[PDB]
Amino acid sequence: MERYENLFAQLNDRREGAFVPFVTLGDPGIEQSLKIIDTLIDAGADALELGVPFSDPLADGPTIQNANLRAFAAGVTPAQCFEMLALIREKHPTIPIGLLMYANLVFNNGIDAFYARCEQVGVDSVLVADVPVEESAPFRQAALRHNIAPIFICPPNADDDLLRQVASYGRGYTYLLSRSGVTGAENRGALPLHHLIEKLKEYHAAPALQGFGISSPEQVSAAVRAGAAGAISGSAIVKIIEKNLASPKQMLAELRSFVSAMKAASR
């Protein structure tokens, strides 16, 4: 979790927000995914959010559903994703790496063993999309035992009790959901989140990253101006992968241009 603490301190000193891309590990294949991730970092990503392909990602809309499918078509398994994570960490010693998991993949061979594997490869946080705070106990306990930040969601419909819980239990960053629904660049958030950002700060929550529907530089700026510590963008990044499958070269050039613009908006 300390990689986040270090990042946010550096960003704060630089009066900067974080820009954090999401991609699915192994989409569209292992080699190309590794190059994709290198490009995201070189282009200015402050941290990564990395999905492990899952059969049934119920918080994800079509774009990221299709990313999961492409990874599966390439034969990608969680074991191979762990191999990939080791390679990423070996190249990039300081960048915070967060996994986007579904509960079954964490529970499957033992919750404790899962977080142990995360610690051994050098992952910094885990967000389990279909585990609400109410079911979080064995997950967050295992995470903290292995020096992994458990990432909690603060939804737009959060009450005070939830804000206090998230603030107390979470580490690394707090995930500030833009809106209801599932992942996707097509649906942009509607309701200002200023009040929630302020309360999280009052309760000493981990710094907030806004995510869901973030697809443009303007929205990155807006997240930061509203007081969030940065923003996450997934579907918008993945769409670039989708649209350029037949030109890996043009794929990387467009990812570089987009991330660089998205990062510039955080400054």
Binding site: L58, P132, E135, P155, N157
Partner: peptide
């Protein structure tokens, strides 16, 4: 059993 849904659906 349990309530293994995204946080958004708990309300």
């Amino acid at each position: 059993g349990g309530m293994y849904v995204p946080q958004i659906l708990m309300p």
